[PDB]
């Protein structure tokens, strides 16, 4: 049911890094990873938390739809794409933390906690600031737990409306061509050690879906592109994508 393929470790060592890739073959109900223990190691989700955060905001009506404009608050931040108006699609695309912090404040601690328990999300612990716990609070989630959560989202089995789940899956759209569709979300955790990068989502094929969750050590922002590049090298090696 789970199989460990250490040959994938080469994809991390080539960049003098360390990490895990977890793949789940939905048709076969079989999982594959280079490191079974790290596959189950729990980290801060960082911006991968925008997936459940989006679902909750939509289902509570904090966000009406994917077109509602959230105006820039006028504070110039170090990420240029953050200093502009956004909707849910672009807020996800550019991982706009301040927009989602406003979501979290409107959701509030009580409803946020209830919804994460309902989602069985990670350790379900939101200790810390209601608008930063996923960056520097007590919430933790592993790669296999990310896949478990994503499988529910894909099948519309989370305890929010179908509409909310469809909109979030629209917002997760990352790449699409004649060969595959990727719906995914990046994360970059820097506020508490160890600094890591995330990429979680799935690859839609004609007759199967491959769910994936990867994280890797990320001492500097220079390596952020490796989150997707390493995942794609594994998918290519396993003949999942050309
Ligand atoms: C060194 O600090 C930072 C802080 C934030 C980012 C960032 C901001 C928005 C999107 C992404 C990204 O995943 O593409 C990364 C980078 C570096
Ligand atoms: Cl879509």
Q: Which structural traits does this protein have?
A:
35% helix, binds 3-(4-methoxyphenyl)benzoic acid, 7 strands, 242 residues, seven-stranded mixed β-sheet, beta-lactamase, binds chloride ion, Antibiotic resistance, Beta-lactamase, alpha+beta, monomer, globular, hydrolase
In short:
The protein has 242 residues and is an alpha+beta fold.
Structure description:
Keywords: Antibiotic resistance, Hydrolase, Plasmid, Signal. Monomer. Dimer. One of its GO terms (cellular component) is plasma membrane. Its EC number is 3.5.2.6. With 242 residues, this protein is an alpha+beta fold. The protein has one domain (1-242): 3-Layer(aba) Sandwich (Beta-lactamase), CATH 3.40.710. The protein contains ten helices and seven strands. It has helices at 9-13, 36-39, 50-60, 88-93, 97-107, 109-118, 133-136, 143-154, 162-171, 226-237, and strands at 2-4, 19-25, 30-33, 173-176, 181-189, 196-204, 209-217. A seven-stranded mixed beta sheet has the order 1-3-2-7-6-5-4, with helices on both faces. A hairpin with a 6-residue loop joins strand 5 (181-189) and strand 6 (196-204). Helix 3 crosses helix 5 and helix 3 (50-60) crosses helix 9. It binds 3-(4-methoxyphenyl)benzoic acid and chloride ion. Chloride ion is lined by residues 170, 173.
Tell me the layout of helices and strands:
Layout: E1 2-4, H1 9-13, E2 19-25, E3 30-33, H2 36-39, H3 50-60, H4 88-93, H5 97-107, H6 109-118, H7 133-136, H8 143-154, H9 162-171, E4 173-176, E5 181-189, E6 196-204, E7 209-217, H10 226-237
Parallel strand pairs: 1-3
Antiparallel strand pairs: 2-3, 2-7, 4-5, 5-6, 6-7
The structure holds 3-(4-methoxyphenyl)benzoic acid and chloride ion.
């Amino acid at each position: 049911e789970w199989q460990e393929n250490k040959s994938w470790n080469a994809h991390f060592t080539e960049h003098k890094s360390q990490g895990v890739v977890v793949l789940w073959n939905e048709n076969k109900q079989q999982g594959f990873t280079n490191n079974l223990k790290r596959a189950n190691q729990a980290f801060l989700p960082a911006s991968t938390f925008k997936i459940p955060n989006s679902l909750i905001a939509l289902d509570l009506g904090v966000v009406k739809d994917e077109h509602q404009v959230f105006k820039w608050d006028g504070q110039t931040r170090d990420i240029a794409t953050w200093n502009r108006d956004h909707n849910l699609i672009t807020a996800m695309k550019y991982s706009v933390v301040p927009v989602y912090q406003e979501f979290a404040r409107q959701i509030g601690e009580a409803r946020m906690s209830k919804m994460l328990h309902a989602f069985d999300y990670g350790n379900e612990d939101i200790s810390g600031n209601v608008d930063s716990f996923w960056l520097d609070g007590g919430i933790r989630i592993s790669a296999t737990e990310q896949i478990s959560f994503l499988r529910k989202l894909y099948h519309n089995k989370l305890h929010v409306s179908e509409r909310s789940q469809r909109i979030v899956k629209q917002a997760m759209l990352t790449e699409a061509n004649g060969d595959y569709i990727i719906r995914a979300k990046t994360g970059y955790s820097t506020r508490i050690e160890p600094k890591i990068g995330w990429w979680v989502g799935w690859v839609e094929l004609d007759d199967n879906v491959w769910f994936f969750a990867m994280n890797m050590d990320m001492p500097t922002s220079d390596g952020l592109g490796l989150r997707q590049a390493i995942t794609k090298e594994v998918l290519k090696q396993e003949k999942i994508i050309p």
